[PDB]
Design a protein around this ligand. Structure first.
Ligand SMILES: O=C(O)[C@H]1O[C@@H](O)[C@H](O)[C@@H](O)[C@@H]1O
Ligand SMILES: [Cl-]
Length: 302
């Protein structure tokens, strides 16, 4: 009845405050029959490890980015395709439609039930050496990515050298030059300290990946109908709050790092970055023929 949950983020981060709210709302709506203890800051382990713990039932709850879920769940892997959404509002429109049900089904199929969707904005490149404006600027650059071969591909097609690595280890790696750069949204770039050791941020906005509040499906299925309704309502309400927190944080984060001296650039012509992803998309299609229509469905959505 007393659950444990994972979140990788630090204090005050939108996801952190929102998962606390999820835990609070779970206890309220279930009259104390179900409670949740959060372990924030990744103190329970890396994201892939936590995903395995939730799937195995060693942990009940996670706030997981879908990036590291992709290698486990083909349908979820669709949101890890570079340049598949035009922007965050587009993503949410796609997720509240048929794409979302398919992604959820695929997830539930691998033992992990999404309960609500969180915003994590768009991810963009950052490094300590120079601005990125064209794919040529990425050639030879060692860029850290999350643990998903779609992202190793993305970097290789821009001529970089990908380095999949745990999020926790990125600050040191940038500090010592083991990697040259990485990529993420404004709040992560700011909260982890990466901006202090990688002060060029280039708005490629190459990935727009949602997150979820995740529950082990056995845990969820064992609930009564009314408790499932309570858990879903808590999750959904936490996520609406998270989305409000998120939009204020993106601006505050961006402003704080610009003030600290970060040099920001837009990418005027993103088209060559997109064009270079042909082989990554085509290589997902070859691995997952059945899911070509999921990709087309998303790209067809306004
Ligand atoms: O880059 C990463 O590993 C991290 O990126 C952040 O944006 C996600 O919120 C976090 O779940 C990931 O662990
Ligand atoms: Cl990680």
């Amino acid at each position: 009845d007393n659950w444990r949950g994972w979140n990788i983020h630090v204090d005050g981060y939108p996801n952190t405050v929102a998962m606390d709210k999820f835990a609070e709302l779970l206890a309220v709506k279930t009259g104390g029959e179900y409670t949740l203890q959060m372990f924030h800051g990744g103190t329970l382990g890396s994201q892939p490890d936590a995903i395995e713990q939730v799937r195995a039932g060693a942990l009940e709850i996670g706030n997981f980015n879908l990036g590291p879920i992709g290698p486990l769940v083909p349908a979820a892997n669709v949101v890890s395709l570079p340049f598949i959404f035009k922007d965050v509002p587009h993503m949410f429109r796609v997720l509240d439609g048929e794409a979302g049900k398919i992604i959820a089904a695929g997830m539930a199929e691998k033992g992990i039930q999404p309960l609500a969707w969180y915003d994590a904005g768009a991810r963009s490149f950052y490094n300590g050496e120079k601005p990125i404006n064209t794919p040529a600027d990425v050639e030879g650059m060692k860029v850290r990515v999350m643990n998903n071969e779609l992202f190793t591909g993305m970097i290789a097609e821009l001529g970089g050298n990908p380095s999949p690595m745990a999020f926790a280890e990125v600050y040191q790696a940038l500090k010592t030059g083991v990697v040259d750069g990485a990529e993420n949204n404004w709040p992560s770039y700011e909260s982890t300290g990466h901006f202090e050791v990688a002060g060029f941020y280039s708005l490629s906005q190459h990935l727009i990946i949602p997150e979820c509040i995740c529950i082990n499906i056995g845990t969820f299925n064992a609930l009564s109908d009314e408790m499932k309704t309570a858990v879903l309502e808590a999750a959904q309400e936490s996520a609406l709050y998270q989305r409000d927190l998120w939009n204020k944080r993106e601006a505050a984060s961006r402003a704080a790092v610009e003030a600290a001296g970060v040099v920001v650039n837009e990418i005027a012509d993103k088209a060559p970055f997109q064009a270079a992803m042909a082989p990554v998309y085509e290589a997902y299609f070859e691995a997952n023929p059945d899911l070509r229509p999921l990709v087309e469905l998303i790209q067809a959505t306004e």
